[PDB]
């Protein structure tokens, strides 16, 4: 086509979706990770995670307001990944890398799994 | 912070939200523009438009499944802008620029209004 493109549009959209998340505006699901609860937008979760895409396209699970993750999932690792979904920024640290990688594999977040594998390989 | 950032994340999120729109997955509102209807995600509309942000943060309108725009709004101009919201690409043409600019002013989409004003100024 003969379209023009606004370079910052995608980043500005995500920044606004994160602002809605911070103010708990139009969040439509609670993700339960053991004793912790995380409110989010189903559409953002699906856009970032192969697991959430599969969950919310299911004819029964699409209507659930609460999703319980596997008990092996670490709430801090989930929190780091939820923040990454809404910001593009990943708080990857020596102390959390194993939990973040395990959570990203479970959530099917391929690019996160890739950088975790590379950061681990560098320290061995 | 000491975060790392994935450059393409925001673009990939928006691409996936557009895929959900194309398959009519988790759309939660119909925007009525005269005889035409447009299905969308309230969160994406709010993230792109000052008017939709104001509408869906209203304690009564947040719960509406149908929103009727002003009868002066052109359905083609709205369609072009809805596509821009989900893609960052704007199909701006000599034949549609007046309708697109009028629709972007109504929707409160400041960057679109700005490029329309500049493209009009160049042709005068």
């Amino acid at each position: 086509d003969s379209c023009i493109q606004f370079t910052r549009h995608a980043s500005d959209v995500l920044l606004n979706l994160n602002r809605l998340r911070s103010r708990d505006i139009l969040t439509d699901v609670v993700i339960v990770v053991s004793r912790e609860q995380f409110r989010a937008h189903k559409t953002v979760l699906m856009a970032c995670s192969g697991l959430f895409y599969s969950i919310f396209t299911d004819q029964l699970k699409c209507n659930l307001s609460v999703i319980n993750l596997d008990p092996e999932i670490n709430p801090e690792g989930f929190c780091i990944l939820l923040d990454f979904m809404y910001t593009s920024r990943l708080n990857l640290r020596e102390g959390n890398i194993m939990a973040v990688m395990a959570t990203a594999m479970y959530l099917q977040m391929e690019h996160v799994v890739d950088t975790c594998r590379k950061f681990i390989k560098a320290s061995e | 912070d000491s975060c790392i950032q994935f450059t393409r994340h925001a673009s990939d999120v928006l691409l996936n939200l557009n895929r959900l729109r194309s398959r009519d997955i988790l759309t939660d509102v119909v925007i009525v523009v005269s005889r035409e209807q447009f299905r969308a995600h309230k969160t994406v509309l709010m993230a792109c438009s000052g008017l939709f942000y104001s509408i869906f943060t209203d304690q009564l309108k947040c719960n509406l499944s149908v929103i009727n725009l002003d009868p002066e709004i052109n359905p083609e101009g709205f369609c072009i802008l809805l596509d821009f919201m989900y893609t960052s690409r704007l199909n701006l043409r000599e034949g549609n620029i007046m309708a697109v600019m009028a629709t972007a002013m109504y929707l409160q989409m400041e960057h679109v209004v700005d490029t329309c004003r500049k493209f009009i100024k160049a042709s005068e």
């Binding site: 023009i4 | 690409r89 704007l90 490029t115």
Partner: peptide, 4 residues
């Protein structure tokens, strides 16, 4: 704005 750019030519994509």
């Amino acid at each position: 704005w750019v030519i994509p």
